[PDB]
């Protein structure tokens, strides 16, 4: 199976702003905060 997610970060270190590590990282786990809508609000 791939591994480009904890890739990105192993090569990271320990780094809480960079580049690809707060990218790939964050989207590789992600809170349904992304660019399209809540989950139910406002009916
Ligand atoms: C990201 O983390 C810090 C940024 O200050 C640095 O040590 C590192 O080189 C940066 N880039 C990567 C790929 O970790
Ligand atoms: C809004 O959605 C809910 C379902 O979660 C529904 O029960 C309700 O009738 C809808 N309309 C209003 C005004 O809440």
Redesign the pocket.
Known sequence: KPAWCWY?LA???????????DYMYSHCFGIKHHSSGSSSYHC
């Open positions: 990105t090569m990271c270190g320990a780094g809480y702003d960079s580049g690809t590590c």
